[PDB]
Amino acid sequence: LKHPPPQILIKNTPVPANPPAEFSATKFASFITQYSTGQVSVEIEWELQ
Amino acid sequence: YFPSQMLRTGNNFTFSYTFEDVPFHSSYAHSQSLDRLMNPLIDQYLYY
DSSP states (O other): OOSOSOOOOOOOOOOBOOOOSSOOOSOOOOBOOOOOOOOOOOOOOOOOO | OOOOOOOOTTOOOOOOOOOOOOOOOOOSOOSSOSSSOSOTTOOOSOOO
């Protein structure tokens, strides 16, 4: 296919753990550990010969 | 050598003018100074 079904991308958005009580510009690297779950449905109509 | 109006007791002279657009006069004092205009709590991303 020149234009196949597109890639479906999914990601859990980060959730900063409690930050320092005093501003720090260094990169944030403390996050609430989490995962996600759910159902996914895919329907395809096929043509028979 | 200028046309001028003449008056006797009973006469009077009147005239009105309109000021041109001009900036307001700054009737205030600054509560900060050029040098001390940054955030006292945070670093810069610039180096010297």
